[PDB]
Amino acid sequence: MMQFTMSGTMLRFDETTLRFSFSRDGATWSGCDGIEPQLTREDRSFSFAGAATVTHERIETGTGVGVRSVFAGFAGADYAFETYIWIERSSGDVLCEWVPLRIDRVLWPAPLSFDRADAHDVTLITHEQGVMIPNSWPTEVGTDAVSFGGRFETAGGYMPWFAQLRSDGHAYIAICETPWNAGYDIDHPAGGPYTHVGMWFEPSLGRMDYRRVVRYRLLDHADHTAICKTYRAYVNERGRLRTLAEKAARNPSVRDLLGRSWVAVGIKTNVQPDSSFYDPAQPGKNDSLVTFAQRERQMRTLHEMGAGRLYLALAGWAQPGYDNGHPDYLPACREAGGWKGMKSLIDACHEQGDLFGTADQYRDYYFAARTFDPRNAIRLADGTMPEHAMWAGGRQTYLCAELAPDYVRRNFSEIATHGIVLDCAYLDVFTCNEGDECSHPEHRMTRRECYERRAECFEYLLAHGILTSSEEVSDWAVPSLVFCHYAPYDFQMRSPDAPRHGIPVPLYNLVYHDCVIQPWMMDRVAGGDDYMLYALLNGGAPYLIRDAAYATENDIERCAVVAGLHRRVGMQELVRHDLVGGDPLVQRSVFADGTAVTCDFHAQTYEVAA
């Protein structure tokens, strides 16, 4: 019905159906017929075309051309909102805006049709490091199987985009320009023949509040590499491509992480009788203690065995024990040797050229915390204070992030008074789990503000010369994050017996390899993959020891191979990644200086060349 042509792009919008298509360089993409743009409330949904009044206006401005649609009245309810869909003159991009005027979820824009029934027609999603889902993929992939329900700014969506790429090189990327109350939905049935992906948006603190915007770029001659580069260029243009070199200009020790092997081990374990981990028929059971002196002797032994340059990330070092008592996670554990033993351990690391970081926690807020007061806690939009008793420390709520920098400043300043000069710090959860929202009147907070406050925690550390790390790499944190516990592939977070959702590809690293340093799992799956092959493809650092929270001479040789590559390319762009001859099981990564890593998953072998 309405047709626009501008700067090489065509947009078509049917006034009656609300469907749209767009075309560029001789490829057309059309919204799925039979999937309507929707609103959701409780157990039921509403097509936008369910509005009592719907008016469309044809627009042209100095910057673009397109259609503004106004929707008013839903079953005598007075809800009203606007959409604006337009071609940007200077780029040929298509922008889609959802504009509140006054709802649990808005599913808009409708997913695009991608049922071509090819084989090499694929969908790219940012659920952890990266997934390439062919239309023929035999495993079902639904939002319910994606971490955090496909929420952006979390492990479900490391980056606020998704893309689909036909086998003839024509592709689109959909970037969510307003990601903080948003996510994607995915529907790929077992065996195909289609995959549908679409944006979702939720209210902020109970109202839709601010305009939601999605930017589509149609590409030709494209590959998953090119699609990732499009996002990288988008991010840099907006000033959030904070490279390691920019980080290192401020904190030169950034460089000292290159070529290090990671050791992540703990001190005190203490499962309270209300934890979901507590076995009441076995009171001792999980409770354990390894002393600072034992960890000191371990580091000395690793050094003497030729483990090379190490980074030690130390968990459960404070009196309450791991996942207990936060944010009152002090002092250093007396039974483990106290501040004196903790300093001895750090001194010893430093003496042998290794680095040291504490693991800590500023979101989980335990009722057992010495200063627990529910006025500091989150209240959800509905007024409630959320609680659960999952972790070792038992009953908890969440500390409102408006207050977290106050506690980080307090705790880290206390640690420094005891002569402990941390190289690094690990703030758990922040860059894996979603940002909370808070309606508490003493500290009201949007999800957006939550990520800013978590970033403010990192900034404190950087300003004090302490390099920042958190659980994963959700890209809100890229400006303030030096490293992570990992940036793993989704299949590495599930049983190796579980069917995978697609072909693993290093989508995150294609954007940000030169911005965030990452250690990689070194596990060998019996009958299956050796995870060292993915560390190499991602030009990552190796774990020498990774003691996962809830439950050598060869390892050193393997770590040396990985750390040697890392020493060279850990600050370089990952320029290209390809499936060699289209074989998903032979993969090749190329870094900025031309170093090429080829991993053959048939043979379980690797080769480093140019």
Ligand SMILES: [Zn+2]
């Ligand atoms: Zn609050």
